[PDB]
């Protein structure tokens, strides 16, 4: 059939891509990073503990001032936290109790959330009428939202569980563009530093580098072997790290277009759910389901540190923009902040 | 020493007071998940969400009909639920083997392992008339080796073949539920159809809360 010759062509194209990736694969990152000293036993320890929520904390996002931090829990609350002095700022009640994501705006003005209600809701913090108000209620995805990140004050990128990411204009209220091409639920996205091309990890073990100003998937990465639960761009925007239910992290490179490092371990049989880099880009923090987190060395692939702590599975993890602290949020209603 | 930061800490204490009030209204509400492949318009008589009240107990029902069928990521979010009201058309093609696999995947998923399942078998009159004019034995060869349990109460009026098929489906769900379980969560089957099924959900949820309170005193 003609479908058969199209599948033969797609198989030839996978062969051509694998050949091109093999041709540019001279020395792995484990090889040319033997001459670097390791980091050592990093005794990161709980500094603050933001014990305010009622249900499990499902997501978290820091402010860009490195002090405020939104946590969204599934008690229907989303509360901004002042990390430096562990006191609340706002406590926003939501519409649907099941939010699966949140996002603090880089301008600090808005906070997004969204979940099983298939709607990214954007709350306005800096209103002159007192209490926070839902400023925008973006409803175009057909499945649940899984992650959302503000590009700037005016436009928000979302990913949903209906194989679509989407760039939305908030002032108008609809999708500026879509991003289709996934075959499973898109569990997370991560912006670049220059905020021009982001990545998305999904439930088909494939991370896509999209282009925001066009809408086309320009690169596609297949290293993992189960549903990618988290993704985070490297601090220069040339690489990114992922993690999945296959108990591994994977550092991919955009320009090299293939997988560079596979952070796995024998004692790790639990899926992982949240990754972030430190400010240098050396510690790949990765929160797992075995109630711990792990401070991998992005160049030695050794477990440089192990974040202890949480009493139920960590669910989200975020490093401040000045790299000062790492906040983890778990299903035991607690946020931990680590230095 | 907290110049106007005192007023910020006082604001945060008022926030904590409001969240204490929300905790008091939160744990007094029983979240339960309606998951099936009507049974829902018999409940609001007193689109996703539902808040109803039985005997001054707040029950909270979320339906997930506006998602896709890839269930494995959005069903983790209901780990803090009190019960999964599972609905299966008892005359399902073979949709009910899909229902058995869905129940088994609910029952064994490592975040739903503390969640009891209220099992509803709708369309029992459809199964009754299908076995009457019949079908089910073509799908299930293990149904030949099956005997109706003696403690199984006969619903007065229905055929014995209806009872043996009915309690076969019930006990087969029970076999899939008890094949792997630490006693940490059970299954509560019923048979609907029409009248108020919500009394069974009330009694069931009270059974789940009581078994959890008993086995957190090591009494079970």
């Amino acid at each position, epitope marked *: 059939s003609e479908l058969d010759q199209l599948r033969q062509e797609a198989e030839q194209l996978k062969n051509q891509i694998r050949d091109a990736r093999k041709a540019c694969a001279d020395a792995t990152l484990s090889q040319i990073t033997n001459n670097i000293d390791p980091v050592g036993r990093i005794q990161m320890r709980t500094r603050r503990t933001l014990r305010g929520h009622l249900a499990k904390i499902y997501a978290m996002h820091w402010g860009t001032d490195s002090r405020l931090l939104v946590s969204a829990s599934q008690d229907g609350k989303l509360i901004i936290w002042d990390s430096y002095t562990t006191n609340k700022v706002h406590a926003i009640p939501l519409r649907s109790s099941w939010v699966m994501t949140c996002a603090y705006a880089p301008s600090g003005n808005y906070v997004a959330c969204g979940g099983l209600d298939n709607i990214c809701s954007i709350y306005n913090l800096k209103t002159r009428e007192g209490n926070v108000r839902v400023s925008r209620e973006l409803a175009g995805h057909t499945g649940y939202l899984s992650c959302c990140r503000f590009l700037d004050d005016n436009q928000i990128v979302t990913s949903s569980g209906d194989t679509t990411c989407a760039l939305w204009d908030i002032e108008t209220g609809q999708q500026t563009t879509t991003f289709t091409g996934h075959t499973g639920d898109v569990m997370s996205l991560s912006l670049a530093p220059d905020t021009r091309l982001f990545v998305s990890g999904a439930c088909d073990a494939s991370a896509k580098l999209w282009d925001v100003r066009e809408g086309m998937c320009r690169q596609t990465f297949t290293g993992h*072997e189960s549903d990618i639960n988290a993704i985070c761009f490297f601090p220069n925007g040339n690489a990114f790290a992922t993690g999945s239910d296959d108990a591994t992290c994977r550092l991919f490179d955009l320009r090299a277009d293939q997988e560079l490092m596979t952070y796995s371990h024998d004692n790790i049989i639990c899926g992982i759910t949240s990754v972030s880099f430190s400010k240098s880009g050396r510690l790949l923090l990765a929160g797992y389901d075995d109630f711990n987190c792990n401070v991998w060395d992005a160049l030695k692939a050794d477990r440089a540190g192990v974040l202890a702590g949480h009493d139920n599975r960590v669910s989200c993890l975020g490093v401040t923009d000045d790299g000062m602290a790492v906040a983890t949020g778990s299903w035991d209603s607690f946020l931990k902040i680590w230095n | 020493l907290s110049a106007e930061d005192k007023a910020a800490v006082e604001r945060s204490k008022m926030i904590e007071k409001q969240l204490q009030k929300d905790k008091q209204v939160y744990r007094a509400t029983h979240r339960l998940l309606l998951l099936g492949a009507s049974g829902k318009s018999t409940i609001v008589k007193q689109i996703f969400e539902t808040k109803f009240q039985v005997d001054k107990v707040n029950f909270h029902m979320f339906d997930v009909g506006g998602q896709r069928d890839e*269930r494995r990521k959005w069903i983790q979010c209901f780990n803090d639920v009190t019960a999964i009201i599972f609905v299966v058309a008892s005359s399902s093609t073979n949709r009910l083997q899909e229902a058995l696999n869905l129940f088994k995947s609910i029952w064994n*998923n490592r975040w739903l392992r503390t969640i009891s399942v209220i099992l509803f078998l709708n369309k029992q009159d459809l199964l009754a008339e299908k076995v009457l004019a019949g079908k089910i034995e073509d799908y299930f060869p293990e149904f030949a080796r099956y005997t109706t349990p003696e403690d199984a109460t006969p619903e007065p009026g229905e055929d014995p073949r209806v009872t043996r098929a009915k309690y076969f489906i019930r006990d087969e769900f029970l076999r899939i539920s008890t094949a792997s379980g630490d006693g940490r969560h059970y299954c509560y089957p019923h048979f609907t159809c029409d009248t108020e099924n919500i009394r069974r959900v009330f009694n069931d949820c009270r059974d789940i809360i009581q078994r959890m309170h008993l086995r957190q005193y090591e009494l079970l």
Partner: nanobody
Amino acid sequence: QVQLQESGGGLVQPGGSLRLSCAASGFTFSNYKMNWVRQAPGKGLEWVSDISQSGASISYTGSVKGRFTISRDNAKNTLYLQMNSLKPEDTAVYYCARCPAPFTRDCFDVTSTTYAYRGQGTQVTVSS
């Protein structure tokens, strides 16, 4: 990359036998439990059979108890389904589908023609 290349299957005599297979590449085949899933023409996808990680725990659907037999070779990284005494209602397109998580028991993989850890499948026809 998760790749599930199937093999074997086509026109076959009712009452006859067949053995179809799935070469599974791109993942550690021993960590996952596997399934055979079928889609009859017109009907949606339905589950057929499960085999666990070590191959110990094994399961079939109702309609094919005794007639089929699933097996797995973790050394060759492949998944075999031996069918015997095939019936004309058992014509379908067959699918090897792995459950999406390692080291677990739960499976969510018979979805509405969108589950990426499931191969292209082979037409298997019982006719005369």
